C-alpha cells in the first residue's frame, strides 16, 4: 500500500490535470475578460433588499385590498337585494331563467324542468382561466343530492340573480379578477364568469359530490375558529349498525375542522379514555386530523354507558389553558343513540353560565329514548341532529356552523372582515389559490326590527380568488440571481409563497389502498385538503431560522445574515451558502413577506444598450440556422412580452421569440424593455466567447461539449451534435448546477445519473461548471456559469497511467462531494457511474461518515408521489438524504475492519475542487457486507405526530373571536 | 329473548325486523314461525 506522500503527490498531478483542462477549455478567464472589457453596454445597480421587500409588501397589500373592495360591494348588494325579496311559490307561472352548470349544453336536449328555464351560453376560450368561459352571466352549481326546483332552491335563483350585475361591475373595473362566487346557505352557489363544471352529474361516470357549505373558504367566513372536542359513546348498545355510523360521522365532522380550529377526540364507556395519543386539544392540521381519523376507526363497543364520566372528562379537556389553544367557541359534541340519564349535575357547575355549547347526535335506527339528549342540547344552547343513514351524515356534520355563526350575525358590521384562506387547489382546476371571504347576513325589515326569527343566520358567504400566479407577478426575481427568492407566510407558519411550494397536495402517511375491495366503477372522493406546507418544512431547518420564522409571525421587521446550508435543486447535494434574510409585514393583512439573498447578489446588471445597430447585431446571434458557428443556442421562457408565450418546446419558442424582434423593433410599447434587452446584451457576450475563443480550439481531446449557461436564459452548447444531449431545463433559474456553481469558489463536478432513460453517461459525460466572477468598480458580480461535459473514456487513460485495470490487490476511486461515484478503477464500478457510492461498497462508505469525512441531513418532502403498499399514485411523504463535506481537512488515513479482516484505505482531497480521491484494498479480500447505505427519496411516515405536539411550533391566532352574544336566541333545537 | 335478544347487532345496514329485542316484537317473531312463513330467515339470523 503506497505511502501518504505518494497519494499526496499523485492526486496533485490529476487535480492539476482536470482543472487545467477545465480552466482552459471552458474559458472562465475569457468570459470574465469580456464582461470587463465593455463596462458601458451595461450599468451595475444595487438590489436594495430593504426597499425591494417594502415595494413588494405593498403590491400584495394593494392587490388584496382591491379584491376586498369588490367583496364588500357584492355583500352589500346581496344583503339589500334579499331584504327586498317576496318569497313567491308560483314558479311554473314565472320562470326563473338561469344557466345551470353540470348540465348537457347540447341544444337538442330540452329537459325544461318546472319552475326553471336554462341558458345556452356561447363560451369563448380564455386566458387567466384555462377553460372556456362566458362573461355575460354567472353559472349556478346545485349539489347533486339537492333537488333544484324546490321552493327553497327556486327562491335563491330568483333573488340571487341580481348579483350578475355586480359580478359584471367588478370585472369591468378590474380585468384580472378571477372567480367571483356567492355560496348560498341553501347549498346553491353562483359564480362569474360562467363555465361548465368539471364533473357533470351523469354524462360521465364520475359524479361530483361537491357542496358549497362543506368548502373551507365557506367555513372560515361562516363562523369563528373553535376548540371542539368530540365525545364518542362506546357502550355496548351502540355496537351494530349504529357503531358503524359513528366512525363515519366523526371522520366527516373533522373534514369541517381547520388549522385555526383545535380539536381532540374522547370516548366513554363507564370511563372516559381519549381515543389516541394526544390528551389535549391539538391543532387539527392535516396531520393531527389524520391521527384522530385513524384512531376513531379501530373502536370497539363494550360496557356500561356513563354520561357523567363522559362530561367530566370533556370539561377538564376544555380547561387545559397550558397548551396552545383557539380559545374561541368552546363546544362539545356527543355521538350517541339513546340516553336514560340527563346528567343534570355535571352541567350545573362545569358550565353554570353556559360558556360551553353542547350538541347531541342520535345515530342509527334504534329504539333508545331521545328525550334526555334533546334536553341536554336545549339546556346548553347547542342543537340536536339525527343521523340514521350514510347519506344523512354529510349535511348534519356540516350544519353546526349555522349555530356558531349566530353571535357573528349579531355583531353587525364589526363582523364583516375579509379573511384570506390557506392556499389550496381550485375547484375548477385553476391552480394554487387563496380566497378572500365575507359573510352576507339576512336582513329583512331592519328599518323597523319586525321579525328576527330566521334573521340570525347568514345568507351565505362570498368569495373571490387570488391565484398564486397573480402574486408571483408582484414579486419579480429576474434582477436577483438564481439564488435569491421571496417567501410569504401566514401567522400560522405556513408559506403563502415559496420556490419549494408545489401544486400537488401535501401528503400524510404511506398510502395503502386495497385492490381486493375497490369496485370497478363507483368513484370515491378524490381530495379536498389545503396545501399547508410550513416554512420550516419548505427549507432545511435551523435554529437561526426558527428565530427568523417566529420573529415574522408576530409582525416585525428586520434583517439577518448568517451561514446556512442550501439544499440543491435536485435532491442530491447540500451547499453551505452564506445568505441574508430580510422580512417585513404586508400591512393590510396577516401575511409577512421575506426575501433571501446571497451576499454578492447585492448588485445586478441592467442593460444600457440602445443603439440601432448594436441591438440589431446581437439579435441574429440567436438564429437556428446560424448554429453552425455559434452553438446550439437555447432561450428561457420568460414572459418577455405579453404576446409571445412560453411553449415548453424550445425550438418553437426561440422562433416565436426571434420572429418578434425582426417583425418589430425591441421598443415594443406593451413590453418590458430591460428583460429583452439584457438577453440581447448577453447573447453578444456568449457570442464573443464562442467566436473568439471556443471556435479556435475546435477539438480539445478530452472535452466533449462546452456550455455557457447565463443570466438571460441563453445557454449555448457548442456543437449541435452535443446540443441534442443537453437534457437541462432551458430556464436558467431552474438549473441545479447553475445554482451550485454560484455558491462555490472552485470548479464544480456534477455526477451523471444512474440508470434512467436517455443518453447520460458515456454519450454526454460528467460535467464541470464554474461561475464567472467579475469586479466592476470593486463590486462583486457573478453573471454566468461556464462549463464542460467531460469524456469519461479519456479521463480513464490518464488515471490508469498503483491502480491498474482489473486490479485485485487494491481499488481506487474519485468521489465528488455528496459521495457519488464519478471515476472507478475496476470497470465493474465504472459501468455504474453517477451512482451513490454507498450502494456499490456500503462497508467503506459507512466508515467514512464515522471518520468525519462526510456529513448528511435527512429531510422530509411532504409533496411527493409513490406507489401504494398492499394493506395510480397517491401523495406521500418521502425522506431524502443528502451528503456533504463537513470537514475541511485534506487527508484521512486509517483502516476499517469488518470482523476478522482489515482493509487499509487512504483518502486524499483534490485541492481547488469538490472532488476527493480514495485508495483502498480490494473488496474481495475481505468478504464483508453491513447493509446497503442508500441515498434516494425513500418512502417513510415521519415525523411521528404524537411527539411534535408536545412541543408545538409557535403560532398566532385570530385577534377577533365572535361568540356568546347575550341576546342570542338560544331557543331553537 | 334470552337466546337472541341483544344479539342481532350486525354491522350491516339491512333491517332484520323479526327479532327478539322487546317482548312485543319477540312475541311477533314466534307467531311468524308458527305459521311457517319465512321461518328459515329467522333461523338464519339466529345462526349468524
Ligand atoms: C491528461 O494528461 C495530458 C497531458 O498532461 C493532458 O493534456 C493535454 O496535454 C498536452 C501535452 O503537452 C498539453 O500540451 C495540452 O495543453 C495545451 O497546450 C499548452 C501546453 O502548455 C498550453 O497552452 C495549455 O496547457 C493547453 N492549451 C491549449 C493547447 O489550448 C493538454 N490539454 C489538452 C486537453 O490537450 C490532458 O488534458 C489530461 N487529461 C485530462 C483532459 O484530464
Ligand atoms: C324574481 O323573479 C320575479 C319573477 O320573475 C321578478 O319579478 C319581476 O321583476 C320585473 C322587474 O323588477 C318585473 O317587470 C316589470 O313588470 C311590470 C308589469 O308587471 C312593468 O310595469 C315594469 O316596467 C317591469 O317591466 C316583473 O313584472 C316582475 N314579475 C312579477 C311577477 O312581479 C324579480 O325581479 C326577480 N328578482 C330578482 C332579484 O331578480
Ligand atoms: C331571511 O329571513 C326571512 C325572515 O326573516 C326568511 O323569510 C321567511 O321565509 C319563510 C320560509 O319558510 C317564509 O315562510 C313561508 O311562508 C309561506 C307563505 O308565503 C308559507 O306558505 C310557508 O309554509 C312558509 O311558512 C316567510 O314568509 C318568510 N318571512 C318573511 C318575514 O318574509 C328568509 O327565508 C331568509 N332568507 C333566506 C335566503 O332564507
Ligand atoms: C407599513 O405600515 C407602517 C405603519 O403602520 C409603516 O411604518 C411607517 O414608516 C414610515 C416611513 O416609511 C414612518 O414615517 C412611520 O413613522 C412608520 N409608522 C409608524 C407608526 O411609525 C411602514 O412603512 C409600512 N410598510 C410598508 C411596506 O407598507
Ligand atoms: C445538518 O448537518 C450539520 C453537519 O454539518 C449538523 O451540524 C452539526 O450538528 C451536530 C449535532 O448533530 C453539532 O454537534 C455540530 O456542532 C453541528 N455542526 C455545525 C457546523 O453546525 C446539523 O445538526 C444537521 N442538521 C440536522 C437537522 O440534523
Ligand atoms: C386497542 C385496539 O383495539 N386498537 C387497535 C390496535 O390494537 C391495533 O394495534 C391498531 C393497528 O391495527 O389499530 C387500533
Ligand atoms: C430498465 C431496467 O432494466 N432497470 C434496471 C432495474 O431493473 C434495476 O433494479 C436497476 C439496478 O439498480 O438497474 C436498472
Ligand atoms: C472544525 C473541525 O471540526 N475541524 C476538524 C479538525 O479539528 C480535525 O483536525 C480534522 C481531522 O479530523 O477534522 C476537522
Ligand atoms: C469470515 C472468515 O473468513 N472468518 C475466518 C474463518 O474463515 C477462519 O476459519 C477463522 C479461523 O482462522 O477465522 C475467521
Ligand atoms: C388596484 O386597483 C387600482 C384601481 O383599479 C389599479 O390601478 C391597480 O392596478 C390595482 N392593483 C392591483 C395589484 O391589481
Ligand atoms: C460568509 O461570511 C464570511 C464573513 O463575512 C465570509 O468570509 C464568507 O466568504 C461567507 N461565505 C461564503 C460562502 O462566501
Ligand atoms: C465513530 O465510530 C465509532 C465506532 O464505530 C462510534 O462509537 C462513534 O459513535 C462514531 N462517531 C460518530 C460521530 O458517530
Ligand atoms: Ca306459509
Swiss-Prot record, chain A:
This protein's UniProt keywords: Calcium, Calcium channel, Calcium transport, Cell membrane, Disulfide bond, Glycoprotein, Ion channel, Ion transport, Membrane, Metal-binding, Phosphoprotein, Signal, Transmembrane, Transmembrane helix, Transport, Voltage-gated channel
Motif, MIDAS-like motif: chain positions: 233-237
Topological category with respect to the lipid bilayer: Single-pass type I membrane protein
Pfam family, one: VWA
Gene Ontology cellular component annotations, sorted alphabetically: L-type voltage-gated calcium channel complex; T-tubule
SUPFAM superfamilies, alphabetized: vWA-like
Annotated localization: Membrane; Cell membrane
Glycosylation sites: 66, 110, 158, 298, 322, 587, 755, 850
Family per similarity comment: Belongs to the calcium channel subunit alpha-2/delta family.
Record's function text: The alpha-2/delta subunit of voltage-dependent calcium channels regulates calcium current density and activation/inactivation kinetics of the calcium channel. Plays an important role in excitation-contraction coupling.
Oligomeric and partner information: Dimer formed of alpha-2-1 and delta-1 chains; disulfide-linked. Voltage-dependent calcium channels are multisubunit complexes, consisting of alpha-1 (CACNA1), alpha-2 (CACNA2D), beta (CACNB) and delta (CACNA2D) subunits in a 1:1:1:1 ratio.
Name of the protein: Voltage-dependent calcium channel subunit alpha-2/delta-1
Encoding gene (name): CACNA2D1
From Swiss-Prot, chain B:
Tissue: Detected in skeletal muscle T-tubules (at protein level).
Binding site for Ca(2+): 37
Extracellular topology ranges: 5-24
Positions occupied by motif Selectivity filter of repeat II: 35-38
PTM notes: Phosphorylated. Phosphorylation by PKA activates the calcium channel. Both the minor and major forms are phosphorylated in vitro by PKA.
Stated family: Belongs to the calcium channel alpha-1 subunit (TC 1.A.1.11) family. CACNA1S subfamily.
Entry note about domains: Each of the four internal repeats contains five hydrophobic transmembrane segments (S1, S2, S3, S5, S6) and one positively charged transmembrane segment (S4). S4 segments probably represent the voltage-sensor and are characterized by a series of positively charged amino acids at every third position.
Subunit comment: Component of a calcium channel complex consisting of a pore-forming alpha subunit (CACNA1S) and the ancillary subunits CACNB1 or CACNB2, CACNG1 and CACNA2D1. The channel complex contains alpha, beta, gamma and delta subunits in a 1:1:1:1 ratio, i.e. it contains either CACNB1 or CACNB2. CACNA1S channel activity is modulated by the auxiliary subunits (CACNB1 or CACNB2, CACNG1 and CACNA2D1). Interacts with DYSF and JSRP1. Interacts with RYR1. Interacts with STAC, STAC2 and STAC3 (via their SH3 domains). Interaction with STAC3 promotes expression at the cell membrane.
Name of the featured protein: Voltage-dependent L-type calcium channel subunit alpha-1S
Species for this entry: Oryctolagus cuniculus (Rabbit)
Lineage: Eukaryota, Metazoa, Chordata, Craniata, Vertebrata
Gene for this chain: CACNA1S
Full-sequence portion shown in this chain: 578 to 625 of 1873
Amino acid at each position: 500500500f503506497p505511502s501518504a506522500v505518494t497519494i499526496k503527490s499523485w492526486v496533485d498531478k490529476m487535480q492539476e490535470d482536470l482543472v487545467t483542462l477545465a480552466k482552459t477549455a471552458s474559458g472562465v478567464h475569457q468570459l470574465v475578460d469580456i464582461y470587463e472589457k465593455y463596462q458601458d453596454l451595461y450599468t451595475v445597480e444595487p438590489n436594495n433588499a430593504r426597499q425591494l421587500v417594502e415595494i413588494a409588501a405593498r403590491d400584495i397589500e394593494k392587490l388584496l385590498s382591491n379584491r376586498s373592495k369588490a367583496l364588500v360591494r357584492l355583500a352589500l348588494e346581496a344583503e339589500k337585494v334579499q331584504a327586498a325579496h317576496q318569497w313567491r311559490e308560483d314558479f311554473a307561472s314565472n320562470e326563473v331563467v338561469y344557466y345551470n352548470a353540470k348540465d348537457d349544453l347540447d341544444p337538442e336536449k330540452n329537459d325544461s324542468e318546472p319552475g326553471s328555464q336554462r341558458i345556452k351560453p356561447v363560451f369563448i376560450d380564455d386566458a387567466n382561466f384555462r377553460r372556456q368561459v362566458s362573461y355575460q352571466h354567472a353559472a349556478v352549481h346545485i349539489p347533486t343530492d339537492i333537488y333544484e326546483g324546490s321552493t327553497i332552491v327556486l327562491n335563491e335563483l330568483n333573488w340571487t340573480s341580481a348579483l350578475d350585475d355586480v359580478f359584471k361591475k367588478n370585472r369591468e373595473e378590474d380585468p384580472s379578477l378571477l372567480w367571483q362566487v356567492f355560496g348560498s346557505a341553501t347549498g346553491l352557489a353562483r359564480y362569474y364568469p360562467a363555465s361548465p363544471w368539471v364533473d357533470n352529474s351523469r354524462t360521465p361516470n364520475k359524479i361530483d359530490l361537491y357542496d358549497v357549505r362543506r368548502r373551507p373558504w365557506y367555513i372560515q367566513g361562516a363562523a369563528s375558529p373553535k376548540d371542539m372536542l368530540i365525545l364518542v359513546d362506546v357502550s355496548g348498545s351502540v355496537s351494530g349498525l349504529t357503531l358503524k355510523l359513528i366512525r363515519t360521522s366523526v371522520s366527516e365532522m373533522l373534514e369541517t375542522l381547520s388549522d385555526d380550529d383545535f380539536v381532540n377526540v374522547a370516548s366513554f364507556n363507564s370511563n372516559a379514555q381519549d381515543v389516541s395519543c394526544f390528551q389535549h386539544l391539538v391543532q387539527a392540521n392535516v396531520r393531527n386530523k389524520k391521527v384522530l381519523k385513524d384512531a376513531v376507526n379501530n373502536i370497539t363497543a363494550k360496557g356500561i354507558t356513563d354520561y357523567k364520566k363522559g362530561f367530566s372528562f370533556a370539561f377538564e379537556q376544555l380547561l387545559n389553558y397550558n397548551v396552545s389553544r383557539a380559545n374561541c367557541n368552546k363546544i362539545i359534541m356527543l355521538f350517541t343513540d339513546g340516553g336514560e340519564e340527563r346528567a343534570q349535575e355535571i352541567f350545573a357547575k362545569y358550565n353554570k353560565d353556559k360558556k360551553v355549547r353542547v350538541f347531541t347526535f342520535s345515530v342509527g335506527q334504534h329504539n333508545y329514548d331521545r328525550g334526555p339528549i334533546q334536553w341536554m342540547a336545549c339546556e346548553n344552547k347547542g342543537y340536536y341532529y339525527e343521523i340514521p343513514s350514510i347519506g344523512a351524515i354529510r349535511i348534519n356534520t356540516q350544519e353546526y356552523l349555522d349555530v356558531l355563526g349566530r353571535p357573528m350575525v349579531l355583531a353587525g358590521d364589526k363582523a364583516k372582515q375579509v379573511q384570506w384562506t390557506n392556499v389550496y387547489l381550485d375547484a375548477l382546476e385553476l391552480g394554487l389559490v387563496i380566497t378572500g371571504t365575507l359573510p352576507v347576513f339576512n336582513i329583512t325589515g331592519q328599518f323597523e326590527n319586525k321579525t328576527n326569527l330566521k334573521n340570525q343566520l347568514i345568507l351565505g358567504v362570498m368569495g373571490v380568488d387570488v391565484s398564486l400566479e397573480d402574486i408571483k407577478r408582484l414579486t419579480p426575481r429576474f434582477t436577483l440571481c438564481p439564488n435569491g427568492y421571496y417567501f410569504a407566510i401566514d401567522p400560522n407558519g405556513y408559506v403563502l409563497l415559496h420556490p419549494n411550494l408545489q401544486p400537488k397536495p401535501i401528503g400524510v402517511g404511506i398510502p395503502t389502498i386495497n385492490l381486493r375491495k375497490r369496485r370497478p366503477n363507483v368513484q370515491n372522493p378524490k381530495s379536498q385538503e389545503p396545501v399547508t406546507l410550513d416554512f420550516l418544512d419548505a427549507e432545511l431547518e435551523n435554529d437561526i431560522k426558527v428565530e427568523i420564522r417566529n420573529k415574522m409571525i408576530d409582525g416585525e421587521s428586520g434583517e439577518k445574515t448568517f451561514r446556512t446550508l442550501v439544499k440543491s435543486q435536485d435532491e442530491r447535494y447540500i451547499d453551505k451558502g452564506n445568505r441574508t434574510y430580510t422580512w417585513t409585514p404586508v400591512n393590510g393583512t396577516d401575511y409577512s413577506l421575506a426575501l433571501v439573498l446571497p451576499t454578492y447578489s447585492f448588485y445586478y446588471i441592467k442593460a444600457k444598450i440602445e443603439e440601432t445597430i448594436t441591438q440589431a447585431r446581437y439579435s441574429e446571434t440567436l438564429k437556428p440556422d446560424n448554429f453552425e458557428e455559434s452553438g446550439y443556442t437555447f432561450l428561457a421562457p420568460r414572459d418577455y412580452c405579453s404576446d409571445l408565450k412560453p411553449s415548453d418546446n424550445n425550438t418553437e419558442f426561440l422562433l416565436n421569440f426571434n420572429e418578434f424582434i425582426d417583425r418589430k423593433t425591441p421598443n415594443n410599447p406593451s413590453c418590458n424593455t430591460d428583460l429583452i434587452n439584457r438577453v440581447l446584451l448577453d447573447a453578444g457576450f456568449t457570442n464573443e466567447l464562442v467566436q473568439n475563443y471556443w471556435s479556435k480550439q475546435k477539438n480539445i481531446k478530452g472535452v466533449k461539449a462546452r456550455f455557457v449557461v447565463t443570466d438571460g436564459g441563453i445557454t449555448r452548447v457548442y456543437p449541435k451534435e452535443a446540443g441534442e444531449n443537453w437534457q437541462e431545463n432551458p430556464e436558467t433559474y431552474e438549473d441545479s448546477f447553475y445554482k451550485r456553481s454560484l455558491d462555490n469558489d472552485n470548479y464544480v463536478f456534477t455526477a451523471p445519473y444512474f440508470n434512467k432513460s436517455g443518453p447520460g453517461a458515456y454519450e454526454s459525460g460528467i460535467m464541470v461548471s464554474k461561475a464567472v466572477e467579475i469586479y466592476i468598480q470593486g463590486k462583486l458580480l457573478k453573471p454566468a456559469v461556464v462549463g464542460i461535459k467531460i469524456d469519461v473514456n479519456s479521463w480513464i487513460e490518464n488515471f490508469t497511467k498503483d491502480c491498474k485495470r482489473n486490479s485485485d490487490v487494491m481499488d481506487c476511486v474519485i468521489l465528488d462531494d455528496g459521495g457519488f461515484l464519478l471515476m472507478a478503477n475496476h470497470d465493474d464500478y465504472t459501468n455504474q457511474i453517477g451512482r451513490f457510492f454507498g450502494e456499490i461498497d456500503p462497508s467503506l462508505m459507512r466508515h467514512l461518515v464515522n471518520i468525519s469525512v462526510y456529513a448528511f441531513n435527512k429531510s422530509y418532502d411532504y409533496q411527493s408521489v409513490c406507489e401504494p403498499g398492499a394493506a395510480s399514485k397517491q401523495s406521500c411523504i418521502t425522506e431524502q438524504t443528502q451528503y456533504f463535506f463537513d470537514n475541511d481537512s485534506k487527508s484521512f488515513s486509517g483502516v476499517l475492519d469488518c470482523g476478522n479482516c482489515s482493509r487499509i484505505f487512504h483518502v486524499e482531497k483534490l485541492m481547488n475542487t469538490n472532488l476527493i480521491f480514495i485508495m483502498v484494498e480490494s473488496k474481495g479480500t475481505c468478504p464483508c457486507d453491513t447493509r446497503l447505505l442508500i441515498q434516494a427519496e425513500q418512502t417513510s411516515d415521519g415525523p411521528d405526530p404524537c411527539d411534535m405536539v408536545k412541543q408545538p411550533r409557535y403560532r398566532k391566532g385570530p385577534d377577533v373571536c365572535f361568540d356568546n352574544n347575550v341576546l342570542e336566541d338560544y331557543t331553537d333545537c | 329473548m334470552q337466546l337472541f335478544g341483544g344479539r342481532y347487532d350486525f354491522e350491516d345496514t339491512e333491517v332484520r325486523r323479526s327479532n327478539f329485542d322487546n317482548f312485543p316484537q319477540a312475541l311477533i317473531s314466534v307467531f311468524q314461525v308458527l305459521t311457517g312463513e319465512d321461518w328459515n330467515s329467522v333461523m338464519y339470523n339466529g345462526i349468524m
